[PDB]
């Protein structure tokens, strides 16, 4: 049975990233912007049923629901050449173009207001899946809808689908720029609290680090949000490569998660991608490039006090790879202790060799992605906790919270979220110890 | 395991010598200025991991750090065809492009100003070296940048790596020309102090002797510093031949040093190169030329009062050499007593047989480098001390030192340098007895 995944694209940023992700998937599968299979892609070996639905016209339609509270972005997607890829019945746009205003409380109240409409959409899409594996929520932690409404939806999904996995592709705000939302740390902390209690996986995407990578490695002067989202979509494509190309092992998300996340609370995964470029790559050269810190697209604090360690590493190697060179590279990495692992368990490091899509042109004969669980993410959670504490100590932006029922009396949900994120940082450090 | 060597090019003279050294190494290994192995150089017998790093694009990049307190030389390197050879992340350049102005105290203050950048670079290179053998600092003792910053770096390397060898190519000033730096003798004494206390081996490069050799042997009318540095680069390429051609014996720097330096303070080595030319040289003809004063590349005063002597000589002969002729040449040299060795220890005369580079066209079947420990080097250290005493007795060029913290209050660092160089001279004389 297929293992269908419903992609929920939330707010302007989430919807734009989802649109580019689906465009990338279409290009990898040889699907036209109108949903027609390309002649060169008619005989593809990719399993589309995991992430796409097949229309009656042999059109592959994404199992994607696009939800936005503002019409502008949804209308731009429906006006794009890729409008026919997505099921039109899966796009909800709030006629009340006021949004959540980057306010978690407003997003939550909006999720509550559209609960029935949203759960009706989710149920319609679930019934439209033959063997739905789970839901992937693609949203930003910095917007209004994706944060507030995202937390509301996380709660409602946890109640409604208690047997289905909830994975998130969470876009983290830039840590290096002063957020215009002084309460952004409060909203983010509340969302992190909900991720900690009601989400199975939060992938932190720091726009600050993505901009830094674009400048230092991509030579992008002043990276635009479009370029950051293109990098994000590249990452999402690499994450879906095991879905799009049938392999021999770890062919399902359940098995991937069980291999990568031995501690349910220790579910923060770091990502690594290669090549990151606008030489015959050897298995050893690939692994060496993947291991360079300068290629990680997430701004985690280098706390010198916490001896962060790897919990698990997955190397997805795409292209003509000699498995014997993979084995030799793993052996050399182990012998050389080139990576620090969690001290309380054996190092779970898997390497999957896969072929590229025959329909997608690959400039690189060999690429590699590293997924690493590393305790230095605690430095990011610590930074978030410090930002929360900095705002809460100033009661900043609390006048709008006191207007909202979740924050009408106090900000205790924000303070509890800041506490939980501090505890998370400390637990990541203990797992570093 | 690789045996990495870091090349440090210090100040105008050190950086120019480092640039010409890297050019010579590149020419010997057939490596392009961008670090890519030339097709004719793909099959080289050189071990690049010792001195070059291999980039992800199969480029071999020299493990060379160019440090100057004045922008002129670094900018000249970055404007040279070899700008791509060096890792840009390994280059620290002081933003104050004023240099030390031929002031030892100013060079020291500049080393203090760029201390963090330098030790960050050194640590980065050490972590990027699998089995870093050591650092070779190429600097001048008489300038400002190369002298002050060179002594500072020698001290800091001796402190951080007190069990690792620190080799220097220390350029001794011309004794026959009026130094433009009236404090140059002070700088020279301070550098001699640092060589005596914190270096295991100092290769003395006398600009007077280099000019003399370039004129008499290269037929260079008015030899330029560039021509002297070209001779130096030829010497450095010949010096790396035992690294580049794998042999059966003396495959490490430790064995060379242990054979050459029986007394840690008596670590001043003179260099000699042959041929010096713009006939099948026999082992016996080589040894006769080496014993010929016209082939020594160091200007030592013929003091008639001090019976200076050779402590040890190593001839590394590269090219098509008959080992039976080498043995016969050693026998003939012994029978003729062409060199006087220390009587209280065995005569250290080493001969290394090496093959010439297949990638470099050699008109000469055999070339040779001589490294010699000879007691007349004490005459060079005495000359430097006497020049220091001549300046100090006149308080010459002290106004710029008094501006620098090391010389603002007193010249005790100069007096200690004079003492250290006196102790070195006296130890060389005792080793002569």
Short mmCIF file of N, CA, C and O in Angstrom, two decimals, chain A residues 279 285 289, chain B residues 56-58:
data_model
loop_
_atom_site.label_atom_id
_atom_site.label_comp_id
_atom_site.label_asym_id
_atom_site.label_seq_id
_atom_site.Cartn_x
_atom_site.Cartn_y
_atom_site.Cartn_z
N UNK A 279 35.52 17.90 -10.73
CA UNK A 279 36.13 17.05 -9.71
C UNK A 279 35.29 15.80 -9.46
O UNK A 279 34.17 15.89 -8.96
N UNK A 285 35.48 11.86 -0.44
CA UNK A 285 35.42 13.30 -0.64
C UNK A 285 34.04 13.85 -0.34
O UNK A 285 33.90 14.93 0.24
N UNK A 289 33.30 16.55 2.55
CA UNK A 289 32.65 17.83 2.32
C UNK A 289 31.40 17.97 3.18
O UNK A 289 31.14 19.04 3.74
N UNK B 56 38.42 20.38 -2.65
CA UNK B 56 37.33 19.53 -3.12
C UNK B 56 37.28 19.45 -4.64
O UNK B 56 36.65 18.54 -5.19
N UNK B 57 37.92 20.39 -5.34
CA UNK B 57 37.94 20.41 -6.80
C UNK B 57 39.20 19.76 -7.36
O UNK B 57 39.61 20.06 -8.48
N UNK B 58 39.81 18.86 -6.58
CA UNK B 58 41.06 18.19 -6.93
C UNK B 58 42.22 19.17 -7.09
O UNK B 58 43.26 18.83 -7.66
#
